[PDB]
Assembly symmetry: D2
Homo-oligomer: 288 residues x 4
């Protein structure tokens, strides 16, 4: 049961990526039980990162671990291809991309051709990043049956949808990307790619371990807490909230996100800490 | 009644922008009655264009006309600010941006702050580009009441939604961006920003003129034809279809779009021409 | 350009239909220029009415006029058929039905069979009542080409959707059901079936006559005020608000709606009346 | 972990409910391990049933068992109240209702008042039937904190939505209604109210018992086959397919559904039976 972290990309006050905080943060997650790192995913501001930034994120993480899934999506297939050729030169877990996005009403064959070109050029295992709420498109198994897919990261609240990939694509690994369904994913899928692993890795790791021991109720109870957190963070902007919580829960600074993904202001950050305090107490009591 | 064209960005077979075709195309549209050009909009592959490409599009068009609305949106407010400072040095109609996109569940204050920063730095009239089907966010008048908005381009099938801007924001110009509602927009709003002006400008211009003369039925009949075209193009990918039709209807080449906005293949292009032929006949009979 | 009214169904405080009030109201409506009355539509609480209540509404109204379109939808086709046979013996304009509702994921063929059965038994002109937002289903022209459809009431905010019927179904009368698009419908379709005709019939009849005279600015001005009323009524429940407003604008009691469509409390009614006061004065200053 | 069955309502070819078939079916279901029967739910064509048909279903079933949850929803609260007073004199598990439906844009307070009225008169435990996809409304815990709710059936694909009830409503029993999430519900909620219990009760009772024994791999394997059945039944209409399958799997006639919920034709029934043959053999090879 794989616990993958869509690692955040630390930015400094001027919006420049801080590769040193990225490395510090990555080491801590690995050390705390995270099995692999999804680089440049939604949580790492993927589509907000230029091609050079995506590449620099992979280079910096490659010093910490080779268990990296490199997300290379952009609205210019040339830049996507460039990153792929670059990644073929490295020893990583695989390359990934979300579907084309923004543009509405694109034919389905456009989605199929995009990935088909990634597969033609890549020498790495293909990981499909399916996030309909973000891209506006759901990638069905129809399209994937041709491609040499190794894994699918499915950010979707419908578990049967994730499970349908398992069913229709023998051999492919499926991981659900929702924080509020971790428990369920660990009881049916090949793992999770959950953003909350950035600030509470030991908690998600504890869920997996409790499930391996057969203590579901303990795992479920931890999910209640995770879900209550989810509700609180929505108000402040989840991704921007995570930056604050990584400092609070893990003891080191990971900077700020980059606008339009606005950082929480000091009044907002303090308001968040006050509001999650009761949940933090409960968590650190059941996990440590 | 303003007829604005979200001009396409011509790309060559290698995906490099062709500024010469852009200039040729722009001259023809102006010559045929288009009042202003929306640069780097959805139809011009805005979010697919790098900041340098957005700038090069404005520079090239600035030789043809100063009636330019410069769209500068990207998922890095620094790059957005850069383009804005650059545009303040020029004599244009204004600067515009769609809302932040891709990232779902961003607080509303994030949308308000993004535009508020554009307004703080820009010395040009602010044009709000509202396209919910593409960005995932609807920009309500609540947020715009603070900002110094000159115009709103509202791509939305609900005309009452566009008309609500008119109502709630005295003095602001509102233009609807739907091809299938042109007729209605010309009878209630300040104009249109319609993608179909790229290949049938004389037709949309004719609608406005027939309406100024009081010949609504003639304008409406032209809308029937436009709508039938809309249905046919959806199948092939509207934006990609437009590139083919600009050659067919206007007699000059505007290249191809850039993948993931895939160009129509030769079999698809011929299939499109065969399928719209009856509509072209009818159009050129009522317009010339 | 026709103005059809989806007349409300007056109920007394015990949830019993008030036939006397229904007749007095219809009488006023026809006198004020309403072209026809649509019985048991959404505004008349159609699906909340029993077989017999639908029947007794037609009977009550048949003592007042012959310009009636009889909606007979329910989730038991046997009951729909009974109502159809009942109306076959009456000299009214036509019979109508919205699509099956509530049940999600019903195959399209079910929608076709529902209507084919109505057409097979009805000796009256068929009126299709399309209200996707209420039923969860959109009736496409595909299905309608097989049926002897005379008219379509399309309650849809996409005016292009209503306009598409005109194109694919030659000779069929198309009316749009939105109050916020009345102006546009009178400029392109066969008419409107708007709930607001219940309390401001003269206003909508004035829009029709002003447009007939080429005074579009004055008709659009009235539309702006209608759309402002629409925003206000949503807080209170539109159908429920209409009852209070009929009394307020027309001078007679039309009773109360029947819960789950709750009547406005005394307090809510005064609140409503205060909000619309400024709009009522501007309206009564332009109409008459 | 409880397995509640939303029992279908058998109709004869004339659209008359077949009480004898209803009793024979319920009898088999209880014998096969079903914990309780939910009467007049969606699967039982609840909203398509008249006041009297709902009543006669409860009466028929009351001669067979006392484990009945009585759903009484209609769009006339007077009728809902009558049904509630009727059931007050019967020794059943509880009374239930889905939210008002059809009418869009009804204020939330209407939903609260609908339920407050039921609670004010019912002398039975209250069961909230939440089915946003059918009614167009989601009942939030906000409303439920004021009511003496004993249970909630949540037909929702977001398992997190069902789980949120457990959190905000201590002591309330929560069941999920999806067939495709049965496995997950049995691992986190109080049970399931799944339509498939009608034709494969032993399969779902087996999942419950396997999970009770810690054999999750075997319960998930059965879930995979259930989800494949779900895909197949959608083509034909799930509720309508269930009738054919009950006969096929259980050995007795449960008649036909009543149109607009059309029965499968002879041809469609054979087609359905062929598609599910491979799945039936794999199922009957794992159950018994
Ligand atoms: Mg009579
Ligand atoms: Mg008895």
């Amino acid at each position: 049961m794989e616990i993958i972290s869509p690692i955040i990309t630390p930015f400094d006050k001027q919006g420049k990526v801080n590769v040193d905080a990225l490395k510090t943060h990555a080491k801590n997650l690995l050390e705390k039980g995270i099995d692999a790192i999804f680089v440049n995913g939604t949580t790492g501001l993927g589509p907000a990162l230029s091609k050079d930034e995506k590449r620099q994120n992979l280079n910096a993480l490659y010093d910490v671990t080779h268990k990296l899934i490199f997300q290379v999506g952009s609205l210019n297939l040339n830049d996507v291809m460039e990153l792929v050729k670059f990644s073929n030169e490295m020893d990583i877990l695989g390359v990934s991309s979300h579907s084309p996005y923004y543009f509405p009403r694109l034919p389905e064959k456009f989605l199929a051709k995009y990935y088909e070109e990634i597969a033609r050029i890549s020498s790495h295992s293909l990981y499909i990043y399916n996030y309909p709420a973000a891209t506006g498109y759901d990638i069905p198994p129809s399209i994937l049956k041709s491609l040499p897919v190794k894994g699918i990261k499915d950010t979707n609240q419908d578990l049967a949808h994730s499970l349908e990939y398992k069913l229709n694509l023998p051999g492919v690994k499926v991981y659900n990307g929702s924080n509020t369904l971790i428990y369920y994913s660990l009881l049916s899928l090949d793992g999770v790619v959950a953003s909350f692993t950035n600030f509470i890795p030991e908690v998600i790791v504890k869920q997996r371990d409790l499930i391996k021991q057969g203590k579901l109720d303990d795992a479920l109870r931890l999910q209640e807490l995770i879900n209550r957190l989810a509700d609180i963070l929505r108000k402040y902007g989840s991704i921007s909230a995570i930056y604050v919580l990584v400092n609070e829960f893990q003891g080191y600074d990971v900077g700020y996100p980059r606008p339009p993904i606005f950082p929480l202001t000091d009044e907002e950050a303090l308001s968040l800490k006050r509001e999650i305090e009761p949940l933090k107490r409960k968590i650190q009591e059941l996990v440590h």
